[PDB]
């Protein structure tokens, strides 16, 4: 599991559960190709998006569907989604944890990058 | 000032100056059409992106080149850029301030939306 | 304006108005001596806390009553208050902007420090 | 383990390791009494601060020594420490995870509160 995403709800002080996300990888022609997808568990975490073999060097984009999450709570939020765009594995394989901290009109995103 | 972007440097405790960004508007075929652009001033602010007449309902994307900012300071950052994607003006004109608070491995973005 | 505090509401996407705060300065016996206070304006800003002559080297604490702010909106928040503790003016006068970005279960605070 | 604190370094994209913190609890006379202390592990986490039996209702203050952390890296940061002040267990026993995301001139703190 070289890529994990964790999402927290800053309004309720809880993991953000059942948050969908779509992961793209930039292709050779500079377009976004589908890479992986899933939704967060009861812990706010999404594990198992990819494998060490599949997660090669590249530019990846994680699109977190924050709008659906807020709308289901009756909140009309600002953002369409929370986006995270990054180059991965440029200097060899790494493990990435992406955290997203969500409020209706604000989000933060942080990466913890470790060398296995 | 229908749309203003303010960028702060959370490492140095200063406005983030000379930060380049492009703004796009989503087209009917889901592609991103060029809309506005500029770079932040010595106050970290970018004013004059659009006018009220031009800034109508749509999904807008602000792509902030945070990578170039950090690289100019000799820091290898995580993100390729900071993206802010939002629907604007769906209830008629509003004034939007997008704030971005930058660190090498983390950013936060917040919107202040006011009715004229 | 040697010390200014700006407070934003990350749930509603607005300045946080009428937010009360007290500023203290640490005494030689480690107790907190009253220094300044006020509440944020309709722009979310609190100006006029001190003057350059009065604002000398020390450890300062800004105690922002975020709990009362959320309770007035019918939200039970996590924090009793948001505290910002920092040494100021140890290299002579500077100008300080303290920003606080508020959510019920999360806050961020950033400083912008400039040399006059 | 009803209280856990996790600290992340937003400059380096890593857990903040060996970060000291001191936890106080407000006494009946409105003074801060010592409650617990420790430092973060290699994962950025501090477990075992207290027990279910000892962690009664009260107002608690976690003081995270962020200044020593940055200084050891050669950075002169803004804050003396990152503070988290909260009422715990007001409606029965809960489990608290406090996360702190650190930059030299900015920090965020978020709580995840769960019912066992
Ligand atoms: N694999 C895969 C996959 C990638 C994307 I981008 C998706 O939106 C979905 I649904 C699946
Ligand atoms: N923001 C944030 C954040 C909160 C928790 I709890 C984490 O484990 C990580 I990694 C990041
Ligand atoms: N965080 C933050 C923040 C700081 C400043 I100085 C701003 O003007 C705005 I808008 C947001
Ligand atoms: N128990 C305990 C304990 C509480 C505090 I506050 C401390 O600063 C130390 I050192 C230990």
User: CATH number of the domain that B98 lies in?
Assistant: 2.60.40.180
Mutate: best of B70, B82, B83, partner A, most A CBs <10 A? B83
Q: Are D59 and C80 in contact (CB under 8 A)?
A: yes
Q: Is A74 on the interface with C (CB under 8 A)?
A: no
A97 lines ligand 2 (CB under 6 A): yes
* A97, two tokens: 């944890």
Question: Does the beta carbon of D87 lie under 8 angstroms from any beta carbon of chain A?
Answer: no
* Cβ within 8 Å, pair A110-B106: yes
Domain count along chain B = 1
Q: Taking a C-beta distance cutoff of 8 angstroms, is the pair B54, B78 a contact?
A: no
Helices assigned H by DSSP within chain C: 66-72
Distance CA A44, CA C54 (A): 48
Quick one: which atom of ligand 1 is closest to the CA of A33?
6
E strand or H helix at C49: none
Task: Tell how far the Cα of D98 is from the centroid of ligand 3, in angstroms.
Answer: 24
CB D60 less than 6 A from any atom of ligand 4: no
Distance CA C43, CA C62 (A): 19
The residues near D59 (Cβ < 8 Å, ≥ 6 apart) are C80, D25, D26, D85, D86, D87, D88
Any idea what the Cα angle at residue C78 is, between residues D6 and B9, rounded to 5°? 60
Tokens, residue D106: 């900015």
Residues recorded for chain B = 116
User: Hey, how many other C-beta atoms are within 10 angstroms of the C-beta on C28?
Assistant: 6
Strand ordering across the sheet containing A58-64: A32-39, A20-26, A58-64, A79-88, B79-88, B58-64, B20-26, B32-39
For residue C57, give the nearest of C91, C30, C105 by alpha carbon.
Answer: C91
Instruction: Tell which residue, D69, D89, D84, D97, has the closest CA to residue D12.
Output: D69
Q: What is the resolution of this structure in A?
A: 1.3
Domain of D72, in residue numbers? 1-116
Distance C69 CA to ligand 3 centre (A): 19
CA–CA dist D100, D88 (Å, integer): 18
SS3 (DSSP) at D66: helix
**Breaks in chain A (C–N > 2.5 Å) following residue:** none
- Contacts with A73 (C-beta within 8 Å, 6 or more apart), sequence order: none
The structure tokens listed for C11 are 């749930």
- For atom 11 of ligand 2, the residue with the nearest CA is A99
Mutate which of C13, C105, C108, C110 to test chain A, going by most A C-beta atoms within 10 A? C105
Largest Cα span, chain A: 44
Is C42 among the annotated ligand-binding positions? no
Q: What share of chain B is helix, strand, coil (3-state, %, to 5)?
A: 5, 55, 40
Length of chain C: 116
Q: Are strands D95-103 and D3-9 parallel, antiparallel or unpaired?
A: parallel
Could you give the strand order of the β-sheet that contains D79-88, starting from the edge strand earlier in sequence?
C32-39, C20-26, C58-64, C79-88, D79-88, D58-64, D20-26, D32-39
The residues facing B30 across adjacent strands are: none
Token pair, residue D16, equals: 């903040």
Rounded distance from Cα B23 to ligand 1 centre (Å): 26
Q: CA distances (Å), B41 to each of A113, B8, B22, in order?
A: 32, 11, 15
**What DSSP character marks residue B17?**
T
């Amino acid at each position: 599991c070289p890529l994990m995403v964790k999402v927290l709800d800053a309004v309720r002080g809880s993991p953000a559960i059942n948050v969908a996300m779509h992961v793209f990888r930039k292709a050779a022609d500079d377009t976004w190709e589908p890479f992986a997808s899933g939704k967060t568990s009861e812990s706010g975490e999404l594990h198992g998006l990819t494998t060490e073999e599949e997660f090669v060097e590249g530019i990846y984009k994680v699109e977190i569907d924050t709008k659906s999450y807020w709308k289901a709570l009756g909140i009309s939020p600002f953002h369409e989604h929370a986006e995270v765009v990054f180059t991965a594995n440029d200097s060899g394989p790494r493990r990435y944890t992406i955290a997203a901290l969500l409020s209706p009109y604000s989000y933060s995103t942080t990466a913890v990058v470790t060398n296995p």
